[PDB]
Subunit: 253 residues, 3 copies
């Protein structure tokens, strides 16, 4: 880093020390249990556009995105292009029930090339997980040997550190994949907030608030990430946004 001489007032510089306190509040308020956490799944489309599934939640997040939800210009598990009563054009059916569909092309170009998953806040980094599952949301072809997570679940340092508050990972997808994501609040020290008398609040306060937002180009995705103070990895593989606050920003450039 590049730093050099600086001056400040003496004991009377409470304005500066107050701003230092504020910087620390922004950086540690997320660790007060039942503070919000934020997880965003950014689908990267062939078209150069992107779509964010943006979740804010205070305790835990259980996400499954199926094939149609992942498509460009959908906002739910509903595809306006594809009237399911028509005999032709059933690409989704052809993928989830092999050789019983009728898509007009091998690769529906609305299906994403991959997702950037951004985890932010007081997350339990040891159990934060992503999986590219098959069409059914399974991590084994045979459900009878599938489990909550697969033997090679995406986790640990596959989630790139982006600051004390954030990690992000890029997950390539092929056309038969779906996406699962898990994040929970960090263990509350030696107390388990999912245990005993603490559970009711942890469970019932957990209103997950999802939004699906589209972006016409990555510049706009990156702007969204800096607006929302969340980690993001751009097309160049660089970490261009973070949840960590610095009192003078990137002043040691």
């Amino acid at each position: 880093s590049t730093s050099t001489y600086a001056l400040r007032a003496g004991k009377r510089d409470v304005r500066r020390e107050q701003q230092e306190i504020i910087t620390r509040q922004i950086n540690t308020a997320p660790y007060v249990q039942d503070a919000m956490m934020r997880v965003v799944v950014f689908a990267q489309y062939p078209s150069g556009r992107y779509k964010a599934f943006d979740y804010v939640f205070p305790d835990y997040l259980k996400v499954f995105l199926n094939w149609r939800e992942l498509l460009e210009d959908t906002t739910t598990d509903y595809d306006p292009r594809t009237n399911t009563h028509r005999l032709m054009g059933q690409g989704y059916r052809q993928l989830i029930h092999p050789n019983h569909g009728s898509g007009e092309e091998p690769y529906d170009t609305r299906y994403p090339m991959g997702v950037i998953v951004s985890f932010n806040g007081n997350i339990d980094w040891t159990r934060a997980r992503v999986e590219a599952t098959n069409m059914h949301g399974l991590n084994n072809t045979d459900w009878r040997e599938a489990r909550a997570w697969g033997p090679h679940v995406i986790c640990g340092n596959q989630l790139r550190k982006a600051g004390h508050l954030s990690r992000a990972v890029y997950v390539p997808l092929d056309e038969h994949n779906t996406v699962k994501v898990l994040a929970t609040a960090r263990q509350d020290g030696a107390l388990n907030r999912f245990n005993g008398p603490q559970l009711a609040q942890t469970l019932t306060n957990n209103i997950v608030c999802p939004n699906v937002i589209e972006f016409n180009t990555e510049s706009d995705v990156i702007d969204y990430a800096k607006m929302a103070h969340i980690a993001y990895i751009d097309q160049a593989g660089l970490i261009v946004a973070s949840s960590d606050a610095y009192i003078s920003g990137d002043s040691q450039a």
Copy 2:
């Protein structure tokens, strides 16, 4: 109240006392834990029409309604008016990602002026809550200082008492708001049904059953409320429906 002379049969008037018992059953059966509770969010539209998000649930309710779900004539987070691939007409995008959208008008007239939230049953009135959050479902502009609820969450006597079984509140909205609602079953005396061996049932039995119903005019909303036995506040600010049962109805008019 207006009451006057009445007669009844003597010890043989079991029909009357049976009906008195039935009145009490309707009024107290909701307090038997794992009985249904009922919460309804009525969106009031500029058009004079309304839309109800009607939830019945036996243990707890965690609701977040985002911008598109709140729009007149939507039934999910999907807006048929707005094809998200078009460059023009992205009003939702303009609100949730400031100055990256293209709505055709400053105020999409399908967005509601406010909601009437109706809580009914054995609800924990001390932790029944509503918030008009921002587009992301946050109660602070900066998620890093946002929490499960805001410092000024709508609660307590902002929820108007409408009988022993019900409360209702009117919540004005501006166009960038979304709505969150929490209701849980009242503490089970000194036992916590969210604790220990009671939790499995409390958790897994809690199938929340949502319906989205539209009403062309308030007369029809009020009818729906009386059909469903739930509190409702009409345009005049009057409580015109309740969950409380009376053996002769409003006979002391």
Copy 3:
């Protein structure tokens, strides 16, 4: 059954005994807690087509399907046929708010005649339940006397045994019905995985993965069932698919 003479190698027939072990793994891996379970609701339409709500989940499943979700060619609670701003054509409204709608026919032929519900895996068979509820998801006309389940909830041996791993039931529906389904993991012996320190995982790992798949004819439904290794009852009332694995298939035909 028809069986007759067979031979095998002696102590060196490890290939056979390995395949016997594999058969047993497929049959008992589902009993390792947090293994996947699979529940499918197959709607049978007047048109001879079917639609599957296919859920895989590791711990519990809480399903409510409302009227519009049940309709042929819907994939969410959204009906493209019916623009809710139009005065005519509101069949759903006419059912859920009696005599306030305007459907074009008494019976919307997209509404199913019944559902086949298929339960598979380490399910608690004593508390696996289905209900055909009314439009609101209630099992009593008056919610104040409704409960999490009705006095005549569909359960026990109404769920037909289809093997050690599976049961299935046919549930007739009339046009004002909706469908509720509950399945949970079997009690973990004398330990309760929904209790104490076990709960956090049981709760947060439970990502339910739903897909809605259509089938143009029952032959294709039956194929889907055999692909997915789940119980299914065909139009003839026969059990034509199962989760149970046999080392030589149905070799005692």
